[PDB]
């Protein structure tokens, strides 16, 4: 009996996308809070730029 891996492949792609998103917010200056989950954005860098 064959194995249906369509959702497994989709989940692997989603995991890759999540890792890419995590890499996007990678930094080397300070820690960024993850309290907003998928809405997280670099607000410290934004504050630095605004000044």
């Amino acid at each position: 009996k064959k194995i249906n891996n369509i959702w497994g492949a989709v989940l692997q792609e989603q995991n890759q996308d999540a890792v890419a998103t995590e890499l996007g917010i990678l930094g080397m200056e300070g820690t960024i809070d993850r309290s907003r989950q998928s809405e997280t954005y670099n607000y410290l860098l934004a504050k630095k730029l605004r000044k």
Partner: protein, 152 residues
């Protein structure tokens, strides 16, 4: 007696976000949040219609009102909305099971809302959208593109 472990409800706990434009102290805002029936929904694609939000959030109960977030200047959808239920139980169910799932292939975030007021559906960023949109430096096709502060 009851068991503390079985009482865990971490998914419906107050988040760290407090509306800075709320006309009241932190205690009053927390009191309103604890008994609120409204949820702020964020991280929506700019092409997410109110019908899709209705379909997704009616799985948790009967929806009273949906207020789509809009550009302050352009008056166009800017990736967030408010969903008000008739009962707190439906809002709790949405926070438990709709939070962190996919709408238009995007992980949407739900938060407790102290209550909708006129003008709260407009982004508070300088460009008229959400503050995160102007403060983000990545590229997002579903949210316009690069951040308004970067703009390529």
């Amino acid at each position: 007696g009851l068991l503390k472990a079985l009482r865990s409800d971490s998914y419906v706990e107050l988040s760290q976000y407090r509306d800075q434009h709320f006309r009241g102290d932190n205690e009053e805002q927390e009191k309103l949040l604890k008994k609120s029936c409204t949820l702020y929904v964020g991280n929506l694609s700019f092409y997410t219609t109110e019908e899709q939000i209705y379909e997704l959030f009616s799985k948790s109960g009967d929806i009273k009102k949906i207020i789509m977030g809009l550009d302050k200047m352009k008056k166009t959808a800017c990736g967030f909305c408010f969903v008000e239920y008739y009962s707190r139980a439906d809002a709790e169910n949405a926070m438990r099971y709709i939070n962190g799932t996919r709408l238009d292939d995007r992980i949407i975030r739900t938060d407790w809302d102290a209550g909708f007021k006129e003008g709260r559906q407009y982004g508070r960023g300088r460009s008229g959208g959400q503050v995160r949109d102007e403060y983000r430096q990545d590229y997002d096709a579903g949210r316009g593109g690069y951040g308004k502060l970067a703009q390529n």
